[PDB]
């Protein structure tokens, strides 16, 4: 009647990968919580794009999802720019 | 490709299994999702660096990630 519950602590991206991506973005220092933040937001991103892609392959009838479908779905996202135009 | 492939593929397939799509993903498609995830996250961290600098902070905090996220209007 005494149970320890299962938990997924990688959540798709490792710690060295997170730190490396943060350095490639110019971040020289982070709080450890960043890890659980990144693992969270990454999911959301995939959660969006996968949906955006699958409905694509759902509207044009197919049993599989091409990389072109996820490029389309990626362009179906918003494009943030550092300036005006 | 900075993200190790095995945990990432695992996560992607789990997300697909929540949507109950039961549609196999092209290997190159999951690869594209990985590359896009890398580019996304790196841009995020640039925005968080800017946010922390404007906050008089060297250390970036989850708040900086959330603000960098809402400034782009995502969930």
């Amino acid at each position: 009647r005494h149970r320890k519950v299962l938990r997924d602590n990688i959540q798709g991206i490792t710690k060295p990968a997170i730190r490396r991506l943060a350095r490639r973005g110019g971040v020289k220092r982070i709080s450890g919580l960043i890890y659980e933040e990144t693992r969270g937001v990454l999911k959301v991103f995939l959660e969006n794009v996968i949906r955006d892609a699958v409905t694509y392959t759902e509207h044009a009838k197919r049993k599989t999802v091409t990389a072109m479908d996820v490029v389309y779905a990626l362009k179906r996202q918003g494009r943030t720019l550092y300036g005006f135009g | 490709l900075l993200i190790r492939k095995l945990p990432f593929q695992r996560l992607v397939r789990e997300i697909a299994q929540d949507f109950k799509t039961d549609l196999r993903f092209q290997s190159a498609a999951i690869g594209a999702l990985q590359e896009a995830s890398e580019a996304y996250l790196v841009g995020l961290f640039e925005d968080t660096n800017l946010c922390a600098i404007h906050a008089k902070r060297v250390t970036i905090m989850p708040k900086d990630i959330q603000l960098a996220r809402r400034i782009r209007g995502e969930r």
Binding site: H2, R3, K4, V5, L6, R7, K15, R23, K28, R29 | -
Partner: peptide, 19 residues
């Protein structure tokens, strides 16, 4: 706490309590 990022093993799953 804070982690200095300038070039400074994590299994897949772990288990804790709460049943």
């Amino acid at each position: 706490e804070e982690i200095d990022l300038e070039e400074e093993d994590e299994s897949d799953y772990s288990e804790s309590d709460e049943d």
